[PDB]
Amino acid sequence: DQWSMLRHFDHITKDYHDHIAEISAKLVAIMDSLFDKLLSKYEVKAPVPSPCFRNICKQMTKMHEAIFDLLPEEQTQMLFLRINASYKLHLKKQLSHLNVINDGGPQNGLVTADVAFYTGNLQALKGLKDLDLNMAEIWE
Ligand SMILES: [Mg+2]
């Protein structure tokens, strides 16, 4: 009956959500290593988008294309929030290293511009328009 069928479904899929998060952990780790490699070398200058940010955004795009049909929408949103958190951590580290501060000066302006390219790229991907990226965190 419908009840027994669904009990079988429940048993078969009981770990589905937890296991997707575990595979997604490996994907976050891959992107985290890319961000560390790229952002450790980032220099603030025109033109924008900088080569660093073009590369980050291209890989984010390719990642989205690769997993779109493999993850439910909510998990894809959650994945991108984790990827974003990694990006912000590495960007914050580099801005601190370079002594770039949020004072409205030309250097701050260039980072704001590069980040606008990043945010625009991310939010233009299917399902990601209303992600709360909290990019202001990078100046903490
Ligand atoms: Mg300046």
Side-chain angles (χ1 to χ4, degrees):
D1 65 19
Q2 70 172 278
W3 330 103
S4 60
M5 166 187 282
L6 295 170
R7 276 180 257 116
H8 293 209
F9 169 93
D10 283 349
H11 177 71
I12 286 162
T13 68
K14 70 186 176 68
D15 293 324
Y16 175 73
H17 294 314
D18 288 334
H19 190 58
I20 259 65
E22 301 174 330
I23 305 178
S24 298
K26 295 161 63 177
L27 191 47
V28 170
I30 290 161
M31 301 299 292
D32 178 75
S33 298
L34 178 73
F35 301 159
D36 170 61
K37 182 186 140 51
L38 294 172
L39 289 165
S40 293
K41 291 179 168 174
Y42 174 54
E43 294 299 303
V44 181
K45 63 179 199 271
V48 165
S50 61
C52 176
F53 280 53
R54 294 194 304 270
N55 283 311
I56 288 166
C57 293
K58 188 164 211 225
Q59 303 311 311
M60 292 279 44
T61 291
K62 286 284 188 216
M63 183 182 87
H64 182 271
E65 285 165 3
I67 56 68
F68 188 73
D69 290 324
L70 293 170
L71 285 176
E73 179 188 73
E74 172 162 63
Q75 278 73 23
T76 292
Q77 287 168 345
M78 299 301 96
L79 170 64
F80 273 83
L81 291 167
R82 300 191 152 172
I83 294 316
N84 183 244
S86 172
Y87 168 80
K88 289 189 297 175
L89 175 149
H90 292 291
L91 177 55
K92 191 157 94 92
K93 185 155 289 167
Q94 182 70 349
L95 293 172
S96 284
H97 171 75
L98 296 170
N99 291 122
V100 179
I101 68 153
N102 196 208
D103 62 3
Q107 210 184 26
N108 176 211
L110 283 165
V111 176
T112 297
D114 237 357
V115 167
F117 177 79
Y118 171 88
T119 301
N121 182 253
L122 189 161
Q123 289 177 335
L125 296 168
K126 290 187 227 189
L128 307 188
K129 168 177 38 75
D130 299 312
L131 257 62
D132 179 358
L133 301 178
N134 187 196
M135 240 61 201
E137 168 166 30
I138 70 180
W139 303 108
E140 317 269 55

